């Protein structure tokens, strides 16, 4: 089907990937340099083979467009994908007073005691962000993320630029420009930074009135992260490609390191089981355009019909 | 052989690619997204179907890996890839007087006339450079430019990074690091450039003690850019494997817009008749390491034996 090379990315790396030894020494199985392509006139690649919640990945990829970094805007819709990052800042700090959670990240997964201590202090973090906008501002702010290396990169000179916004421009002026590119990856920040973006760069390309996008993506978690960054390109390009009047036309997904957990063997040989169905189907308020000022409500999955989710531990 | 999946992309765009019109509307048969694979361990990818002159690609990296910026050491080695870019400067320019050299690219190539005009007062401002301090300063740097990219990245609050420099500290020790990137894409740079890079970022990769690279290279002409641009970065992967003390792996080579400009079919037909030969191999000075105190002398090719070179007349 559509989710085919998704599918051939994971059986490439079970039968032909070295272990390799990670940060968190869980230890991979990786390969170097992989290149998928879905057809977007095909049909929108949510994994059939496995649930994957769109709804999370509309909440965030809105928040990048709305060139946000402030968690509030994720937890007003129930989306938590970020709040560790922005947790650990409250913990590390002194306004914070409390049972000190130091590497929590481990020590929440090998304690069901300590683990409903952090799952709860998190309680009211997350309430503290909702409610009380001083906090929002001092906690919930995560300064380098998506969004505002997307639209409001930092220039030595103090302004700002908002580099999607710009490049858009330019498809409207001038579609054939082959230089069509937004990148996350500053190299001033790239050192004190928790999480270096993963998704460092992309290129736009448009021909025959179709829109396409080229994703490089320096490490993937093939079981866990892919399925979800797929869907978020492909969502983008089709924003793009609704903004400016195109078609869709192609995502490429271009990856550097793209590793399987060595724990993840299980559950991804499961999902080989399954056989893909039909892929959804993309649609779009067809009266709004202005994709910055989009909702929920605006973007919305036909069609989807997926096999069960898959449980797996995650990787700390 | 080892060159073939040069010639395979060649072949895949001929009887392939759409017409895209570029910017010299020469136009253009082009793809998006693409990407091969080169194992060094097999030998260094320097065409044999045609001749590649190593000496430009040797002097021009080491331009690059010294952090120069000034068309001055490129000259003293005969190389003269960057003159037009500096030269453009004097031209546009107050100390300047002279015969206009107003899109002295077009104007040079339909007009013998001209063309002795331009070849010749060229000929000047490069010796100029050459023998004028004052003037090579004045002229001859170029700013922003490989060299300084990789090597002196301005930061925002006045300082400068050497990348470069940094990942290899970095992949000696932390081998296994997933975030052993260079960028030379600026983005507040690259809206007012001449032409802002082609070779947007790349990425190493260690594992079983050897050394791979990938490059994302944005924008790629066939004919006459790719067949450089493979060299440099094998060569680059090499010096880098050397210094840190590994083997060499791949070098893997991910293009967004790679195209053939419409006027060189003739010339690239009549390359894919030829039969590859066994491909060259590459040699460094044993005995120096810092590779940024590298050469000419210290790095050497074997067994290249090509084809004859083919001229094609170069896109205006
Ligand atoms: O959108 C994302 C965000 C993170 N990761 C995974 C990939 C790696 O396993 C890890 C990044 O860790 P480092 O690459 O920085 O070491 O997170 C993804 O796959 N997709
Ligand atoms: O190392 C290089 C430098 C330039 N080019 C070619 C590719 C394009 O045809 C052109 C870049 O033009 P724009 O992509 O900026 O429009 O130069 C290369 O292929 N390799």
Same mark, same amino acid.
Request: glycine content about 6%; some cysteine.
């Given at each position: ?58 909440? /965030? ?51 069901? /005691? ?203």
């Amino acid at each position: 089907m559509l989710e085919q090379p998704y599918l051939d990315l994971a059986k490439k790396v079970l039968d032909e990937g070295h272990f390799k030894p990670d940060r968190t020494h869980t230890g991979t199985y990786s390969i170097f340099g992989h290149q998928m392509r879905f057809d977007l006139s095909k049909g929108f690649p949510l994994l059939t083979t496995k649930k994957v919640p769109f709804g999370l990945i509309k909440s /965030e990829l809105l928040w990048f467009l709305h060139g946000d970094t402030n968690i509030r805007f994720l937890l007003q819709h129930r989306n938590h994908i970020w709040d560790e990052w922005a947790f650990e800042k409250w913990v590390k700090s002194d306004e914070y007073h409390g049972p000190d959670m130091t590497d929590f990240g481990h020590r929440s997964q090998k304690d069901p /005691e300590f683990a409903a201590v952090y799952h709860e202090e998190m309680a009211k973090f997350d309430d503290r962000v909702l409610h009380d906008d001083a906090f929002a501002a001092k906690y919930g702010d995560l300064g380098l993320v998506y969004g505002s290396q997307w639209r409001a990169w930092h220039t030595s000179k103090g302004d700002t630029i908002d580099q999607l916004g710009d490049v858009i421009e330019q498809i409207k002026t001038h579609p054939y420009s082959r230089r069509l590119i937004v990148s996350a990856w500053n190299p001033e920040d790239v050192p004190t930074m928790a999480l270096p973006p993963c998704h460092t760069l992309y290129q736009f390309y448009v021909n025959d009135g179709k829109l396409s996008l080229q994703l490089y993506q320096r490490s993937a978690d093939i079981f866990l992260g892919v399925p979800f960054n797929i869907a978020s390109y492909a969502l983008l390009t089709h924003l793009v490609a609704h903004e400016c009047g195109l078609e869709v036309g192609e995502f490429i997904h271009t990856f550097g390191d793209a590793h399987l957990m060595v724990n993840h063997l299980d559950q991804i040989k499961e999902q080989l089981s399954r056989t893909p169905r039909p892929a959804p189907t993309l649609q779009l308020n067809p009266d709004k355009h202005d994709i910055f000022d989009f909702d929920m409500k605006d973007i919305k999955l036909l069609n989807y019909d997926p096999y069960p989710a898959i449980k797996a531990p995650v990787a700390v």
